[PDB]
PDB file of C-alpha atoms and ligand atoms in Angstrom:
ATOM      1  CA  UNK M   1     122.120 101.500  61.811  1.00 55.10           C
ATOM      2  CA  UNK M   2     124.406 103.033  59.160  1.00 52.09           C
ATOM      3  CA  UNK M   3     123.184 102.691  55.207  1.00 52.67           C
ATOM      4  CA  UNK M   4     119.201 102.109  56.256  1.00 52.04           C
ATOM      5  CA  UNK M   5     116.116 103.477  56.409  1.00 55.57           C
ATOM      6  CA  UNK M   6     113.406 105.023  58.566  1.00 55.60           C
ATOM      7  CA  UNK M   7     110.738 101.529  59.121  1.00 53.01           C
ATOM      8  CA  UNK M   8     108.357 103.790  59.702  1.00 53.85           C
ATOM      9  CA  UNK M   9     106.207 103.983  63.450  1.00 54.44           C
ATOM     10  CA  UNK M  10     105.611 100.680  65.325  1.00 57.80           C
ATOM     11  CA  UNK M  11     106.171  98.859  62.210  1.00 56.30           C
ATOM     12  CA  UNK M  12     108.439  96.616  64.234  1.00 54.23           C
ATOM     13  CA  UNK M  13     106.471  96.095  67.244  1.00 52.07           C
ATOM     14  CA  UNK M  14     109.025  93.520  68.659  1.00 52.07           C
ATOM     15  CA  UNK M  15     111.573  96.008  69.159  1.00 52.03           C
ATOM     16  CA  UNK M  16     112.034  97.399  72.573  1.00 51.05           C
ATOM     17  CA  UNK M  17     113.999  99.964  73.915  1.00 51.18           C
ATOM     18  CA  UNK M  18     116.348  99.202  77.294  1.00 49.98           C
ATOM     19  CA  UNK M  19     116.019 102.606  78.976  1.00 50.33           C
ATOM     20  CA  UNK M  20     118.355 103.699  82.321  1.00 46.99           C
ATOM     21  CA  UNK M  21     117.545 107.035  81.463  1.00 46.20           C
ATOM     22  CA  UNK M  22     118.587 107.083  78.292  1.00 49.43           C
ATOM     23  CA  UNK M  23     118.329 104.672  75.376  1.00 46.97           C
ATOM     24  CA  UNK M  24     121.603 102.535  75.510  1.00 47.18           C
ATOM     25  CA  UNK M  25     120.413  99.082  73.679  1.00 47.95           C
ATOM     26  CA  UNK M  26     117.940  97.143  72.109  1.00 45.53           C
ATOM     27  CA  UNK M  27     116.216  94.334  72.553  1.00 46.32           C
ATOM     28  CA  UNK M  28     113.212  91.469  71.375  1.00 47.71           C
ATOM     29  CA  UNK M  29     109.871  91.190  72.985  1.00 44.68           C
ATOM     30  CA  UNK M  30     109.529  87.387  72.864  1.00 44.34           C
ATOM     31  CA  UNK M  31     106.237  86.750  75.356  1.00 39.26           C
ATOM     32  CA  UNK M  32     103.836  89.698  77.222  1.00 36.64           C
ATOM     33  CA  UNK M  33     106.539  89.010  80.379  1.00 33.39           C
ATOM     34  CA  UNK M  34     109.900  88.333  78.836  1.00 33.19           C
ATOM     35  CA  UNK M  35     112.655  90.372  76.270  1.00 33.36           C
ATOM     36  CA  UNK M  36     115.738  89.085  74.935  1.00 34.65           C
ATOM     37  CA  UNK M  37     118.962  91.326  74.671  1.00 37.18           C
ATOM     38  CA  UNK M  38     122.460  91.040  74.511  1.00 38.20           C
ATOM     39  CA  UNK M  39     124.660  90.003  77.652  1.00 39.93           C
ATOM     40  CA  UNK M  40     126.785  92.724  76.680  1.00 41.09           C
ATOM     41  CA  UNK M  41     123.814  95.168  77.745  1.00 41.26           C
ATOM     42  CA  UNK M  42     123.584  94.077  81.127  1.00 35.85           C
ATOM     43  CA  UNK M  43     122.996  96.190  83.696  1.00 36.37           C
ATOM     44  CA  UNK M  44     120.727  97.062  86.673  1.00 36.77           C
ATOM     45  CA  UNK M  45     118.093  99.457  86.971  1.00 35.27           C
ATOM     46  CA  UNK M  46     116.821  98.875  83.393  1.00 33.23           C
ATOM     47  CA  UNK M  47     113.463  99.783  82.379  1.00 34.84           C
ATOM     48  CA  UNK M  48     111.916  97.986  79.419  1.00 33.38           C
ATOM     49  CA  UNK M  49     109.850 100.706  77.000  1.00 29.46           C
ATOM     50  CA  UNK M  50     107.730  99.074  73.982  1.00 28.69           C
ATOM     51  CA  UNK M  51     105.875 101.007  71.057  1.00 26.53           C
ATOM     52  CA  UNK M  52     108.191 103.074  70.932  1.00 26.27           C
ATOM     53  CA  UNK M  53     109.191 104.903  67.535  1.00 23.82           C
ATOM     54  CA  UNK M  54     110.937 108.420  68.248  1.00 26.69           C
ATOM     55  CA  UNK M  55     112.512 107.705  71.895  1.00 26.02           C
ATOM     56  CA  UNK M  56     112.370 111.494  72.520  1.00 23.70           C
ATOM     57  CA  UNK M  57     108.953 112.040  72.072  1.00 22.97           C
ATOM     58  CA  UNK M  58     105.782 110.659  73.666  1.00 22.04           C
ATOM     59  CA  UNK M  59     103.672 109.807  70.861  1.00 22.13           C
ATOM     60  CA  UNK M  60     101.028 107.546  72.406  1.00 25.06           C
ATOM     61  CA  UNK M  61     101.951 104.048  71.969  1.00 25.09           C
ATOM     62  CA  UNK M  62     104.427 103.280  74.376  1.00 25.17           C
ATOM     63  CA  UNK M  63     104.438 100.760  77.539  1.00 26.00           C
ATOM     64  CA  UNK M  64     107.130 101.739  79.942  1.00 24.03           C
ATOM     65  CA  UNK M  65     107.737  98.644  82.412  1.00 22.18           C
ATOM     66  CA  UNK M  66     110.569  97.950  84.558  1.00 23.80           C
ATOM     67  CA  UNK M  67     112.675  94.605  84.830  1.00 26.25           C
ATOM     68  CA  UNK M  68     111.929  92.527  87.963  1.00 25.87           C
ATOM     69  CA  UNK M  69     114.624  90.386  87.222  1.00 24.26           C
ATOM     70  CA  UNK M  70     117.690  90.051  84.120  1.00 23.59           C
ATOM     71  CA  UNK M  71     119.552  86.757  83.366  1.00 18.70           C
ATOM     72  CA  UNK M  72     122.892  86.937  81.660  1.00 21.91           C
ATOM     73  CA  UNK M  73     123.460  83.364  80.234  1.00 25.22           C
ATOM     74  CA  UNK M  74     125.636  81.268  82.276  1.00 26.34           C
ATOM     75  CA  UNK M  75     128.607  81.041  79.926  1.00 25.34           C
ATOM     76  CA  UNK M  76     128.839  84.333  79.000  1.00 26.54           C
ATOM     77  CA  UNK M  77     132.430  85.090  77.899  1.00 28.55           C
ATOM     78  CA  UNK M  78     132.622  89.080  77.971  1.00 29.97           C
ATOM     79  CA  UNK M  79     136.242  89.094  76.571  1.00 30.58           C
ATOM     80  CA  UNK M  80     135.386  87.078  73.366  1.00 29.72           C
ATOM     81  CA  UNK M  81     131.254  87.521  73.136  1.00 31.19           C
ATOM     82  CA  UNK M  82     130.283  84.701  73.065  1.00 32.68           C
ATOM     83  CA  UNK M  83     127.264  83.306  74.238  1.00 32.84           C
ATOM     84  CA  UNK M  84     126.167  87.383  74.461  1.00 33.86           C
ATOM     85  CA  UNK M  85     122.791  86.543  75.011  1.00 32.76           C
ATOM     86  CA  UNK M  86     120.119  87.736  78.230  1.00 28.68           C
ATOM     87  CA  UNK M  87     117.026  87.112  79.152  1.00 29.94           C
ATOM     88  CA  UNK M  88     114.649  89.859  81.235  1.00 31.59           C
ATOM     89  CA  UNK M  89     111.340  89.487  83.001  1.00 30.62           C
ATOM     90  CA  UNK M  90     109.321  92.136  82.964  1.00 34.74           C
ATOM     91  CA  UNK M  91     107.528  93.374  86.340  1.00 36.08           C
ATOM     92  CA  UNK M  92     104.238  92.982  84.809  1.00 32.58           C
ATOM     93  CA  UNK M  93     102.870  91.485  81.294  1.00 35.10           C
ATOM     94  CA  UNK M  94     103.031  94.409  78.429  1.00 32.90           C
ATOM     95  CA  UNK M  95      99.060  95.089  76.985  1.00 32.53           C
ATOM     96  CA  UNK M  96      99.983  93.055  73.201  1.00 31.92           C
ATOM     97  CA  UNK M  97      98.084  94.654  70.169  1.00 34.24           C
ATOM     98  CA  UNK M  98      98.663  96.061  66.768  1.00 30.74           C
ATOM     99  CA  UNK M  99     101.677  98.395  67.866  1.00 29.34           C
ATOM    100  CA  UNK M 100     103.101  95.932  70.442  1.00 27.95           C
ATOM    101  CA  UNK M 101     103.708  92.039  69.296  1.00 29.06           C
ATOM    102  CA  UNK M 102     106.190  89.558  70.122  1.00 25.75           C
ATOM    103  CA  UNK M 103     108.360  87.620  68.094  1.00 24.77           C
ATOM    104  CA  UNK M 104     108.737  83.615  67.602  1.00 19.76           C
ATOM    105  CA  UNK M 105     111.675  81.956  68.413  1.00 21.38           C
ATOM    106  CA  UNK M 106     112.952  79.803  65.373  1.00 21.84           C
ATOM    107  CA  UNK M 107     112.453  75.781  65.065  1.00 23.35           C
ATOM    108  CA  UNK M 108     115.639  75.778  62.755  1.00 23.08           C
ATOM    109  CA  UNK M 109     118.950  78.099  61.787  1.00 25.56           C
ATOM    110  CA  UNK M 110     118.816  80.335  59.084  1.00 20.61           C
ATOM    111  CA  UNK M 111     121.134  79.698  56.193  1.00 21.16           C
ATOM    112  CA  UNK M 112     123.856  82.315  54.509  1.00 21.19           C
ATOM    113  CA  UNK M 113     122.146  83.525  51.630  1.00 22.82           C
ATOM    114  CA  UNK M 114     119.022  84.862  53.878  1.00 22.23           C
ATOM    115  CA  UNK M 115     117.684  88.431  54.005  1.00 18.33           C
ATOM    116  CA  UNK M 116     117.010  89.755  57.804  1.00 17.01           C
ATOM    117  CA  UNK M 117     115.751  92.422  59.129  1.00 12.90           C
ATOM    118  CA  UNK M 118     117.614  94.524  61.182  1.00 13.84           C
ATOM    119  CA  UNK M 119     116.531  97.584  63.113  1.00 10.42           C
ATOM    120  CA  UNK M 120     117.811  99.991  65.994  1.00  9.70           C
ATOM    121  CA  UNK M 121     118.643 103.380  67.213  1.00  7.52           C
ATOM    122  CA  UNK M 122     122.135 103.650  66.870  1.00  5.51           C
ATOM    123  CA  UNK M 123     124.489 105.387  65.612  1.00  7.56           C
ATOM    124  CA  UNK M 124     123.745 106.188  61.477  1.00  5.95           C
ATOM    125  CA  UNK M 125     127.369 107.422  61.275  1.00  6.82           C
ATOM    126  CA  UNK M 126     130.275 104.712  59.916  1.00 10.77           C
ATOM    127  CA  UNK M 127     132.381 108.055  60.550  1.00 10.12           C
ATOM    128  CA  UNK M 128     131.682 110.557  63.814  1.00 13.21           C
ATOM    129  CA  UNK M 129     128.220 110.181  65.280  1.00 12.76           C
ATOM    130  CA  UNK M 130     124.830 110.997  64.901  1.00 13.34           C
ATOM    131  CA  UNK M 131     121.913 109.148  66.458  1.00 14.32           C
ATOM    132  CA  UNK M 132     118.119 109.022  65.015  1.00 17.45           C
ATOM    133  CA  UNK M 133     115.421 109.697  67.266  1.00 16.31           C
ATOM    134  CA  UNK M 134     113.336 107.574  65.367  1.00 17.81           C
ATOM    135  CA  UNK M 135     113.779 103.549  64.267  1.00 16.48           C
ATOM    136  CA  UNK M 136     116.134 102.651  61.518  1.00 21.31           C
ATOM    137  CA  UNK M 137     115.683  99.681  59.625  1.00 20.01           C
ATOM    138  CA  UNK M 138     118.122  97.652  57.199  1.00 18.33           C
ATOM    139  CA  UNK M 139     117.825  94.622  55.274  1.00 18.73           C
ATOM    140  CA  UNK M 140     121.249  92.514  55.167  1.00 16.93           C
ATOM    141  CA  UNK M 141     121.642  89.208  53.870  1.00 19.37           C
ATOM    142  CA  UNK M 142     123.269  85.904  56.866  1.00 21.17           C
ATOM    143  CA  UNK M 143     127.153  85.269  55.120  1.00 18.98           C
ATOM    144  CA  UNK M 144     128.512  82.299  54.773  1.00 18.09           C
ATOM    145  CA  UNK M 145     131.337  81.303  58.014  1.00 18.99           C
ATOM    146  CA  UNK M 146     133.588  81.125  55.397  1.00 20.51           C
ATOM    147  CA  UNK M 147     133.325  84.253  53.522  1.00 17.51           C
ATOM    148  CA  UNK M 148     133.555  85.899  56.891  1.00 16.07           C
ATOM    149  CA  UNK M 149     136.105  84.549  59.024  1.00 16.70           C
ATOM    150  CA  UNK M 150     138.023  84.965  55.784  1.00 16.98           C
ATOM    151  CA  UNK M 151     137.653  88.733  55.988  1.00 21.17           C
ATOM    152  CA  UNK M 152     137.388  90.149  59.290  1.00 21.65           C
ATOM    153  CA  UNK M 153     140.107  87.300  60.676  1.00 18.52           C
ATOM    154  CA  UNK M 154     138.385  87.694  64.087  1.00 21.72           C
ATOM    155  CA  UNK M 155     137.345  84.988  65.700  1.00 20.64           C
ATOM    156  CA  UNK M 156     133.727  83.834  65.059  1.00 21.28           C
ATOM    157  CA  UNK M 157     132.202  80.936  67.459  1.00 22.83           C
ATOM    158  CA  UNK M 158     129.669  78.325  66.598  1.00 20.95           C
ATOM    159  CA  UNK M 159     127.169  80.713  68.708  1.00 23.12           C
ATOM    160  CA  UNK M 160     127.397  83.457  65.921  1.00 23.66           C
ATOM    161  CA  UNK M 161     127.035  84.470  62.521  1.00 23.10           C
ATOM    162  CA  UNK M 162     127.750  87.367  60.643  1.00 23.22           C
ATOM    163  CA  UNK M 163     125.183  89.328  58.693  1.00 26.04           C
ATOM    164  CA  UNK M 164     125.954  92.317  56.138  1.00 24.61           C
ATOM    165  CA  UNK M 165     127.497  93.493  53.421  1.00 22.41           C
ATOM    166  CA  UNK M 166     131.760  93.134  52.779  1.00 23.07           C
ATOM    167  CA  UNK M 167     131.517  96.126  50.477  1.00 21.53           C
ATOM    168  CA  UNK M 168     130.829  98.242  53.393  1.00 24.30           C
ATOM    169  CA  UNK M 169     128.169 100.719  53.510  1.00 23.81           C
ATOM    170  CA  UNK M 170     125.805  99.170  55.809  1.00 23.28           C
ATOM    171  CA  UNK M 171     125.684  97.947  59.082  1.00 21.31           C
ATOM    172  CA  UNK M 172     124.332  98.094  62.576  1.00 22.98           C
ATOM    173  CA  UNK M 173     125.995 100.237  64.999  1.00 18.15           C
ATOM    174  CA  UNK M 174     126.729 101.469  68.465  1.00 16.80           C
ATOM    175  CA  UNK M 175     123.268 101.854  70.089  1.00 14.58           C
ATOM    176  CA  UNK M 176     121.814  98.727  67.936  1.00 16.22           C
ATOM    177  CA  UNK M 177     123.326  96.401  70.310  1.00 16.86           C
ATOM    178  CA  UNK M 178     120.867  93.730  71.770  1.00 17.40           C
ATOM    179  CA  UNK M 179     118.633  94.801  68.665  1.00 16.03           C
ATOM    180  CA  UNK M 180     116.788  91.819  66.996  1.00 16.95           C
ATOM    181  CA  UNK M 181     117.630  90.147  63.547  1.00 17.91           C
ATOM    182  CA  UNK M 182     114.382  88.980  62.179  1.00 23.80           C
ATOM    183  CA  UNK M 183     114.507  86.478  58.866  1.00 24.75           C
ATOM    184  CA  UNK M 184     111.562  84.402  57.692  1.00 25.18           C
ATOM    185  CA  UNK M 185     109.335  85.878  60.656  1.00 24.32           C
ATOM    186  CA  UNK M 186     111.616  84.704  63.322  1.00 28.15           C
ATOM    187  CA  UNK M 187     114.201  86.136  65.785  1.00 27.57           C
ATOM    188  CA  UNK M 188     117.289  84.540  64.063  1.00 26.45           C
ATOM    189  CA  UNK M 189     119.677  86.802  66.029  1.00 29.01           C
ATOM    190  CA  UNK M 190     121.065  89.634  68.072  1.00 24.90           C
ATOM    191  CA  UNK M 191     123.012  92.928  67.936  1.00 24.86           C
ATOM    192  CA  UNK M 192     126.295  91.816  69.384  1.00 24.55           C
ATOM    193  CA  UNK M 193     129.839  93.164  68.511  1.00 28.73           C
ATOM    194  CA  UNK M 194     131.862  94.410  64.910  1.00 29.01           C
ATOM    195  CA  UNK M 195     134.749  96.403  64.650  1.00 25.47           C
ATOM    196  CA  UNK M 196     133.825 100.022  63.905  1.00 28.18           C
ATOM    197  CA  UNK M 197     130.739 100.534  61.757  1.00 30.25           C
ATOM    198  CA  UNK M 198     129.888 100.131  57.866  1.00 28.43           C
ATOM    199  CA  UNK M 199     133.795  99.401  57.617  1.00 29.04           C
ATOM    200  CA  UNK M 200     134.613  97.919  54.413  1.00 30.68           C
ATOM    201  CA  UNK M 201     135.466  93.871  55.324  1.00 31.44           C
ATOM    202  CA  UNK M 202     134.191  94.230  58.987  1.00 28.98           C
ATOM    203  CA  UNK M 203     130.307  92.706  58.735  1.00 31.66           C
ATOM    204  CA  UNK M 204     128.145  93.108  62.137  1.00 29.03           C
ATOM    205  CA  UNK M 205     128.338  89.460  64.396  1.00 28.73           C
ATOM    206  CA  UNK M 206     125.408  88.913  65.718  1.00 31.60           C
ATOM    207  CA  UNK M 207     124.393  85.606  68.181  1.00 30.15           C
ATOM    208  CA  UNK M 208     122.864  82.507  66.983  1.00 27.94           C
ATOM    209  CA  UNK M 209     119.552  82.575  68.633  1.00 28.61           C
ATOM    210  CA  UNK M 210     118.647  79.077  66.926  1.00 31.29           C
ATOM    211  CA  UNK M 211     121.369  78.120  69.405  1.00 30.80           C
ATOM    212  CA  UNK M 212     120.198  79.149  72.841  1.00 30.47           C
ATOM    213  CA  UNK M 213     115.896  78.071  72.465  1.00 29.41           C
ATOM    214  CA  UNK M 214     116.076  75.390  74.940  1.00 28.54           C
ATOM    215  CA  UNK M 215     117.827  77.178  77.430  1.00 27.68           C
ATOM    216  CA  UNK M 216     115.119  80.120  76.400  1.00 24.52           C
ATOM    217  CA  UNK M 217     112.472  77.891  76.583  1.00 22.04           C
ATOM    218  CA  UNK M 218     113.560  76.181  80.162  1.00 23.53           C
ATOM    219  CA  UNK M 219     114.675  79.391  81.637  1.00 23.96           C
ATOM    220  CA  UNK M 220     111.143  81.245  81.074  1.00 22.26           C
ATOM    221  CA  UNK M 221     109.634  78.039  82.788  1.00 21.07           C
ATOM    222  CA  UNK M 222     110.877  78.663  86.175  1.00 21.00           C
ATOM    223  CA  UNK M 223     111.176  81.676  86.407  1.00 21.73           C
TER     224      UNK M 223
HETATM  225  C1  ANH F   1     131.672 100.480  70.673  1.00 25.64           C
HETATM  226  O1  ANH F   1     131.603 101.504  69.608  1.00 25.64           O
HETATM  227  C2  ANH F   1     131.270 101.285  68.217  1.00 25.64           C
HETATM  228  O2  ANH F   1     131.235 102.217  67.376  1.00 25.64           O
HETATM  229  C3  ANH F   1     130.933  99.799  67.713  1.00 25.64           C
HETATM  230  C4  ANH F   1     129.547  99.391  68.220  1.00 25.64           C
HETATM  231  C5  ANH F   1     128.874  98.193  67.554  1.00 25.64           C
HETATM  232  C6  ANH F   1     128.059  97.348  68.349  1.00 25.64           C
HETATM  233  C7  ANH F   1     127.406  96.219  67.787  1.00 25.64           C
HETATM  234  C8  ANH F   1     127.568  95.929  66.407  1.00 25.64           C
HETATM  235  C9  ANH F   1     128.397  96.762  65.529  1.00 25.64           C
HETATM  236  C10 ANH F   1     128.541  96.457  64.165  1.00 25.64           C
HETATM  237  N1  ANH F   1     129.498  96.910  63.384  1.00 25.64           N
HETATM  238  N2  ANH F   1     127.715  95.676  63.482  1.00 25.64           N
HETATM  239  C11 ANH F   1     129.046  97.905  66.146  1.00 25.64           C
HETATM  240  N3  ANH F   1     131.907  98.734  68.086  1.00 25.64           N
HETATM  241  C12 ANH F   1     133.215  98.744  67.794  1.00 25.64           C
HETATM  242  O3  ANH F   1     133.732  99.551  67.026  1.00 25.64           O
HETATM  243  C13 ANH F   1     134.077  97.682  68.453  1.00 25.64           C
HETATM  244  N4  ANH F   1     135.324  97.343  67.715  1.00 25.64           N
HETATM  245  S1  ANH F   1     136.824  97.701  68.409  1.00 25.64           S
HETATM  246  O4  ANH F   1     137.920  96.985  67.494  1.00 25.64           O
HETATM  247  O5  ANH F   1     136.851  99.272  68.375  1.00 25.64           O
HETATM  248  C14 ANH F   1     136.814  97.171  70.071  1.00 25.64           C
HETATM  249  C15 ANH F   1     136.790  95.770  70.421  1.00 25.64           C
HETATM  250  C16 ANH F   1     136.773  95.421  71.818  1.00 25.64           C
HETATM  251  C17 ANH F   1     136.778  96.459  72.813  1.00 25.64           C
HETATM  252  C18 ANH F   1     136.757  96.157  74.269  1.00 25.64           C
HETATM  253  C19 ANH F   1     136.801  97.828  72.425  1.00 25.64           C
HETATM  254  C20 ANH F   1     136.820  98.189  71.067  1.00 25.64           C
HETATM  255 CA1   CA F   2     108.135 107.752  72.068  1.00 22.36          CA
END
């Protein structure tokens, strides 16, 4: 997260950390069994940690519990991102409390105009690197399609959204990706691609979560 603040420990206790021995994405906790992450993030061996708040030091709140199982969504497009959304079960049901909670799915899309909440532990940096050991947070308002595609000229499907500011500044990052995008209480969307960081005219994309409940929904059924 570049431009943000420190939320402060287990203030987000949805977050999760996807750990293969090192931090290398983010994620949701949506139910005691199941996270959401980007498709993007795929990859096998992963181990889910929760509570966490500096990833470096064991401070007393975390649940480390490995994936039994990850599915990428069937129409996954890796070239242009689209449909960068995954589901993974855990191997058994996280303890829920005070420092670990899950987050609702929304009922409806959020419109441009909205304030989310975005958090990670990625890169701070919009130039050269530097990565927090503790969770950033940022608030950044959903643009309008318009407004974006406009600027960045990349293309934008249906299935996302951009989120940020044009004047640059502030962003999510490398690291952030599969992170959550909270607005109005719900998980409205996910880390997913941008070009560079904080770059003036180059707001985050994140995926349309509003999009992809049913398939959520059905998917956590059977499985
Ligand atoms: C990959 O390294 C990076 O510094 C960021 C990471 C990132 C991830 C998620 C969200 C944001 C964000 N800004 N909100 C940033 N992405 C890039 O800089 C990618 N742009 S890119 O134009 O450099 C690019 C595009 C496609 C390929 C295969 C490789 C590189
Ligand atoms: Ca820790």
């Amino acid at each position: 997260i570049v431009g943000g603040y420190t939320c402060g420990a287990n203030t987000v206790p949805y977050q999760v950390s996807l750990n293969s021995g090192y931090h290398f994405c983010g994620g949701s906790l949506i139910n005691s069994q199941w996270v959401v992450s980007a498709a993007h993030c795929y990859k096998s061996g992963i181990q889910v940690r929760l509570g966490e708040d500096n990833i470096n030091v064991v401070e007393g709140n975390e649940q480390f519990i490995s994936a039994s199982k990850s599915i990428v969504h069937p129409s996954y497009n890796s070239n242009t991102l689209n449909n960068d959304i995954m589901l993974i079960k855990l191997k058994s049901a996280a303890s829920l409390n005070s420092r670990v909670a899950s987050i609702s799915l929304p009922t409806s899309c959020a419109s441009a105009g909205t304030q989310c909440l975005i958090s990670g532990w990625g890169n701070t940096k919009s130039s050269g690197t530097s990565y927090p050991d503790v969770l950033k947070c940022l608030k950044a308002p959903i643009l309008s399609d318009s407004s974006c595609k406009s600027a960045s000229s990349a293309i934008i499907t249906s299935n996302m959204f951009c989120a940020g500011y044009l004047e640059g500044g502030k962003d999510s990052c490398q690291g952030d990706s599969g992170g959550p995008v909270v607005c109005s209480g719900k998980l409205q969307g996910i880390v997913s691609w941008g070009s560079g960081c904080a770059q003036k005219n180059k707001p985050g994309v994140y995926t349309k979560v509003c999009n992809y409940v049913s398939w959520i929904k059905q998917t956590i059924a059977s499985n």
